[PDB]
Amino acid sequence: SSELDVNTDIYSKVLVTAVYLALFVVGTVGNTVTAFTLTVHYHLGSLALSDLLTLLLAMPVELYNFIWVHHPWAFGDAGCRGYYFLRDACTYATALNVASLSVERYLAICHPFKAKTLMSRSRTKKFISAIWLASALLAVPMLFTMGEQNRSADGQHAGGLVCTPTIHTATVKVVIQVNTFMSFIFPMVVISVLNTIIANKLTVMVRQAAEPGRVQALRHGVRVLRAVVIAFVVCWLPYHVRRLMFCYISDEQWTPFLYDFYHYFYMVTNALFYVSSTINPILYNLVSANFRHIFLAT
């Protein structure tokens, strides 16, 4: 009956939850004030909203039955599906919002005129609504794949059931493999390429100028424009590589030591994943003073 437990240290749970709460009190407020503060404005607001919902949805529910010591699922069979669907939808929203924000910055800095028509001003609201809809549309498998299962050998214990991939490991593997490319590799490459070319366009300006803060401003601009990609790497790659080590490795290799190591890796990867939610308004403040004025005023 009690074969499905995890032996991660309780003090580790306390530390993880404290860090989670700190990141929450940061992001949940920062992203909301950013959304209120507000073509790039629409993209920034959409990204802030995606981060805000990620923190509001993933962190709390996971904090007890996943990010705590109790293995039995406590949100019900419907919760088994709703939690994962919401998590996947918010992850897609964040990744695609970052990609679209990079695209918008590219258009503004490299195509100043035609961007007015292509962005079509107020139609950027419809564009961000479309990206949110696509994010919600790409996460349907999280509804009918993570359902409650009677996993315990007894089948009637106090924790015999828990939310797990229903389908065979092959289908879980293929769905996760498409998910990683559609949510990490594609946005990652788009962001990296566009940010690199924008940084080149800023460096040519810096060379041409080579002012009191113009040089400093452009230097910090390129610094942050690269730190964005570095933060994407750090915050996102661990999550997807953990999911890969979950889905790809079959029953042959699994051992209690690696089992517990993966469980701790869960805490580490999720902490890194949530760090990205808070990182955004920090960089927004560190970049632009005009935005910082309203942000600190409000």
């Binding site: 996943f66 293995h71 797990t164 699994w254 089992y259 869960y266």
Partner: peptide
């Protein structure tokens, strides 16, 4: 054993 939490 095998992990149940994705």
């Amino acid at each position: 054993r095998r992990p149940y939490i994705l």
